[PDB]
Amino acid sequence: VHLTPEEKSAVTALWGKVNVDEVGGEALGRLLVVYPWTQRFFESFGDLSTPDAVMGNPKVKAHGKKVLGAFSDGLAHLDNLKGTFATLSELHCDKLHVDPENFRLLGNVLVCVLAHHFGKEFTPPVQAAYQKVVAGVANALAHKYH
Amino acid sequence: HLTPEEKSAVTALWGKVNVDEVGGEALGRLLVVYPWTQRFFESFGDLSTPDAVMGNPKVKAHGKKVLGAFSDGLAHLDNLKGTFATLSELHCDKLHVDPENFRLLGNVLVCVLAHHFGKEFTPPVQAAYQKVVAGVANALAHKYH
Amino acid sequence: SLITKLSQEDGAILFPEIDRYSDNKQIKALTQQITKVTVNGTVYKDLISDSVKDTNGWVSNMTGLHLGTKAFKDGENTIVISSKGFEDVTITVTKKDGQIHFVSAKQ
Amino acid sequence: SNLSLITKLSQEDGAILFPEIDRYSDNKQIKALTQQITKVTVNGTVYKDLISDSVKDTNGWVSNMTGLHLGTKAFKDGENTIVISSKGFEDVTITVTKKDGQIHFVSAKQKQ
Amino acid sequence: VLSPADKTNVKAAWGKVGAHAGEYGAEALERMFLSFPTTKTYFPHFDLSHGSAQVKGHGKKVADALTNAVAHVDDMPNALSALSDLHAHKLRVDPVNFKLLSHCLLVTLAAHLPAEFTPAVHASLDKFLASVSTVLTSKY
Amino acid sequence: VLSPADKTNVKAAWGKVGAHAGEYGAEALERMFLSFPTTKTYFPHFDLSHGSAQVKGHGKKVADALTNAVAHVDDMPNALSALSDLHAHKLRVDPVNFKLLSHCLLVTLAAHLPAEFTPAVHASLDKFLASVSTVLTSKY
Numbered sequence: 001v002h003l004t005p006e007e008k009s010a011v012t013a014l015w016g017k018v019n020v021d022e023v024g025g026e027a028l029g030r031l032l033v034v035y036p037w038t039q040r041f042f043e044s045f046g047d048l049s050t051p052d053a054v055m056g057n058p059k060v061k062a063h064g065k066k067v068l069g070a071f072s073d074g075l076a077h078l079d080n081l082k083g084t085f086a087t088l089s090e091l092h093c094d095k096l097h098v099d100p101e102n103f104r105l106l107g108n109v110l111v112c113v114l115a116h117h118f119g120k121e122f123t124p125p126v127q128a129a130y131q132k133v134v135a136g137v138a139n140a141l142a143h144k145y146h
Numbered sequence: 147h148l149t150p151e152e153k154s155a156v157t158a159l160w161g162k163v164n165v166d167e168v169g170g171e172a173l174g175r176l177l178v179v180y181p182w183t184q185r186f187f188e189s190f191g192d193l194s195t196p197d198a199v200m201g202n203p204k205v206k207a208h209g210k211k212v213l214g215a216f217s218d219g220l221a222h223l224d225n226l227k228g229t230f231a232t233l234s235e236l237h238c239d240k241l242h243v244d245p246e247n248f249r250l251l252g253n254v255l256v257c258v259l260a261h262h263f264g265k266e267f268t269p270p271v272q273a274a275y276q277k278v279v280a281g282v283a284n285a286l287a288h289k290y291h
Numbered sequence: 292s293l294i295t296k297l298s299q300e301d302g303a304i305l306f307p308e309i310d311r312y313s314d315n316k317q318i319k320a321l322t323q324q325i326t327k328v329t330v331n332g333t334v335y336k337d338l339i340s341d342s343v344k345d346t347n348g349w350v351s352n353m354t355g356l357h358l359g360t361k362a363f364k365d366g367e368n369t370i371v372i373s374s375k376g377f378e379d380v381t382i383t384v385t386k387k388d389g390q391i392h393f394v395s396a397k398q
Numbered sequence: 399s400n401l402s403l404i405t406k407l408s409q410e411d412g413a414i415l416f417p418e419i420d421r422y423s424d425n426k427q428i429k430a431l432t433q434q435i436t437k438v439t440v441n442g443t444v445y446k447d448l449i450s451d452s453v454k455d456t457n458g459w460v461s462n463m464t465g466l467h468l469g470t471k472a473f474k475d476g477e478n479t480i481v482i483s484s485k486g487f488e489d490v491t492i493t494v495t496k497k498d499g500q501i502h503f504v505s506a507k508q509k510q
Numbered sequence: 511v512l513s514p515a516d517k518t519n520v521k522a523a524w525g526k527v528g529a530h531a532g533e534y535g536a537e538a539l540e541r542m543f544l545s546f547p548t549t550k551t552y553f554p555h556f557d558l559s560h561g562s563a564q565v566k567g568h569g570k571k572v573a574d575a576l577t578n579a580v581a582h583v584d585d586m587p588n589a590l591s592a593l594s595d596l597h598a599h600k601l602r603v604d605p606v607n608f609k610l611l612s613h614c615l616l617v618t619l620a621a622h623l624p625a626e627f628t629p630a631v632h633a634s635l636d637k638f639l640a641s642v643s644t645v646l647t648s649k650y
Numbered sequence: 651v652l653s654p655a656d657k658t659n660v661k662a663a664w665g666k667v668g669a670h671a672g673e674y675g676a677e678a679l680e681r682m683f684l685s686f687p688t689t690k691t692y693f694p695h696f697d698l699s700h701g702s703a704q705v706k707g708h709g710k711k712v713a714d715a716l717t718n719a720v721a722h723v724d725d726m727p728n729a730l731s732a733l734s735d736l737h738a739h740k741l742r743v744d745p746v747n748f749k750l751l752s753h754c755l756l757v758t759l760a761a762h763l764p765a766e767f768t769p770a771v772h773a774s775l776d777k778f779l780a781s782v783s784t785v786l787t788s789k790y
């Protein structure tokens with residue numbers, strides 16, 4: 001995945017406004033509510049039976065912070081996503097057995113959360129740059145499958 | 147990656163493949179089973195029925211080009227990305243084919259092999275061929291990213 | 292004015308502008324619809340994806356039109372390309388001391 | 399000058415339909431002409447492209463998967479003249495007759 | 511497939527769109543053409559630049575088709591039958607593209623409905639757009 | 651959407667299976683576990699070795715549910731309603747896995763029906779297996 005200088009600038013300007021303690025939890029929580037089969041992987045998290053149980057779950061909030069931190073890591077190394085995510089790819093592919101289609105779904109839920117938070121600021125060109133980012137992160141996480 | 151036993155099973159079955167027909171059969175079945183793929187082959191003429199597709203000379207000739215590229219992949223299993231780099235750029239930049247269709251063509255090829263070989267196409271032989279066709283699909287999607 | 296040059300390969304020549312994936316829809320359709328290729332009167336066979344080295348054969352692929360040099364002779368050589376629903380394209384090339392040069396293309 | 403491609407119409411509530419004016423036609427010339435329509439007039443009255451709204455009893459037109467729909471607001475008893483303009487195409491003149499609530503296809507013409 | 515709660519959510523959220531339907535459809539198409547450029551090959555006869563009348567008109571066609579599907583949520587395969595014939599038989603749209611436009615429609619709704627796009631409403635709208643896509647890919 | 655020709659093809663091909671339904675269901679499951687090993691995680695307490703009685707047992711239940719779906723091809727959502735509830739609510743099977751089993755069922759049919767697996771029959775069986783998958787993933 002390669003971003004133009006104008007795309008890289010737009011991505012970094014929006015990301016500086018992201019609340020790192022909430023956005024990851026919101027994206028993970030929405031993934032668990034919108035695609036309920038993903039709950040199969042987070043059974044140790046306890047109650048995920050309703051959208052309130054999911055969105056208020058402390059383990060969902062804390063895990064979503066780890067996930068958002070890995071997305072931030074990717075944003076700082078856009079030209080070497082495969083290397084940056086090598087250990088995480090080994091974890092998700094060899095140990096957890098997450099189908100790589102779910103990486104694409106999480107990336108798209110994150111894009112919906114950014115659109116929801118930023119509204120009109122999340123313009124079609126800003127979204128196009130974020131789509132390259134989330135596809136690159138998903139492809140780097142799926143690398144140990146191939 | 148393929149184990150030595152998987153690599154051996156793949157090569158033994160592939161040597162029995164009729165290179166003039168199997169590619170046409172796989173392309174023809176892709177056009178019949180997933181008809182939206184016909185959007186890319188309007189220059190091939192009549193594809194209105196399964197008989198017009200399977201009997202079309204351009205479908206048969208194109209299948210030979212496709213099977214030849216799969217054979218090239220089989221000879222370079224450790225460097226599929228490099229082997230398919232120019233084909234990957236072509237399919238993206240010139241043909242605009244969504245990479246999901248590469249997975250569909252690989253699966254149709256697996257069905258053609260099962261159909262021709264029957265009982266010989268065992269579950270372990272198929273598992274080795276699934277690694278090959280997923281590796282070819284991933285190499286052809288590489289220059290999209 | 293669309294065919295203006297050629298390249299030399301092992302026992303074959305290549306016309307890059309005769310491109311079946313051209314951005315010019317007329318060049319793309321003409322190459323896709325090729326029905327006959329003749330070199331000095333000799334009919335060439337479409338080899339589909341096989342090598343054209345030292346053959347009376349042609350292949351149209353992503354790098355252009357590859358023609359074998361089996362029917363090539365010293366001096367003026369005439370290549371005629373026929374395409375369904377298009378006027379014939381005549382390519383004139385010269386061969387001297389193992390080198391093949393582009394002379395002209397007409398239609 | 400006679401247009402052999404437009405030969406009939408169907409009647410709808412407060413509208414007429416030309417199914418052969420097809421933006422998805424297998425004939426590339428019909429498809430391009432329908433796609434590039436810039437002006438529709440009925441008895442001199444300029445019609446508005448309603449995009450996807452109903453043309454029932456309007457001075458409006460819509461080109462969709464069933465053909466070219468024209469509202470019958472500007473239609474009068476006797477001979478009616480429809481003029482269709484399309485970018486890079488010669489104007490298409492359609493003649494229809496209206497009598498006792500019924501609209502009949504008379505002819506379609508275009509230069510070249 | 512779509513539960514009574516999903517139908518309530520879709521009707522309430524799509525009712526907030528109202529007169530902005532064409533505007534949101536045009537915005538979703540622009541998001542799709544910029545994020546997934548291969549989708550532009552389906553509109554070779556279009557001026558695809560920002561604010562083009564053709565993209566604006568097509569966006570209104572798409573949003574009105576969706577408003578009609580919301581009104582016929584109890585019998586969507588019948589209401590969308592002719593439209594699904596067109597997309598499969600004439601346009602030959604690859605089924606993957608329906609997921610791309612559905613995602614761009616959801617992004618547009620999330621950007622314009624900050625006070626209503628809850629996790630349950632998001633899930634209902636996702637189910638609705640997937641149901642429309644299922645009908646629109648059923649005629650292959 | 652399954653045309654009269656598709657229904658004829660599915661009934662003729664599935665009718666050739668006959669008494670081999672359990673055997674072919676077990677073979678399709680074995681093809682799936684070997685080709686797509688992540689699918690094994692859905693059966694943690696199963697003996698998944700070659701020729702295991704648990705795999706044979708499960709293969710016959712899968713094959714019989716497919717035989718029932720062929721008999722109720724005109725009203726499949728109703729016939730597979732309880733099975734849709736189990737896979738989505740209790741087992742939480744990821745919808746991508748239905749494409750994997752459908753592919754392995756097609757590969758098994760191709761391997762056992764040399765004369766019957768023509769391109770048209772292949773397309774009919776693909777449409778049938780996709781319709782079963784759609785029904786089985788409808789209760790999310």
Ligand code: HEM
Binds near residue numbers: 041141
């Ligand atoms: C593409 C986006 C993703 C990113 C960046 C990501 C990142 C992470 C990170 C940073 C961890 C912690 C690793 C550690 O403990 O060292 C993790 C764990 C995990 N991930 Fe992901 N992940 C992604 C997608 C997914 C998806 C889609 C699923 C499942 C549907 C998933 C399921 C898990 C599970 C089950 C764990 C372990 C949680 C635990 O036991 O606490 N991941 N991921």
Ligand code: HEM
Binds near residue numbers: 283
């Ligand atoms: C993964 C498997 C695939 C392989 C190995 C493959 C291989 C090839 C090869 C060898 C060529 C000829 C390139 C040249 O002219 O030099 C080609 C062309 C082409 N491919 Fe593929 N291809 C694959 C999948 C697909 C799929 C799935 C589609 C579409 C649905 C597609 C559509 C085309 C088209 C439209 C052409 C050009 C045909 C023409 O103009 O004659 N390919 N491919």
Ligand code: HEM
Binds near residue numbers: 461576601611
């Ligand atoms: C939510 C899904 C969709 C809806 C509701 C929708 C709706 C529509 C409508 C209402 C029309 C006009 C039909 C007519 O003329 O009667 C149309 C046309 C068309 N659609 Fe779709 N569509 C959808 C998805 C797609 C996708 C995914 C693509 C491709 C990326 C696509 C490509 C087209 C094209 C090429 C046309 C013809 C445009 C023209 O010639 O003006 N559609 N669509």
Ligand code: HEM
Binds near residue numbers: 743
């Ligand atoms: C063609 C599609 C499928 C059909 C017709 C089918 C059919 C069935 C049937 C009839 C049962 C047994 C019902 C019962 O006795 O309670 C069952 C159970 C089950 N299915 Fe499926 N199934 C399909 C796809 C899948 C897929 C794709 C997976 C996952 C990879 C899966 C995983 C399971 C599991 C884990 C059980 C429970 C096994 C047990 O512990 O007894 N199924 N299925």
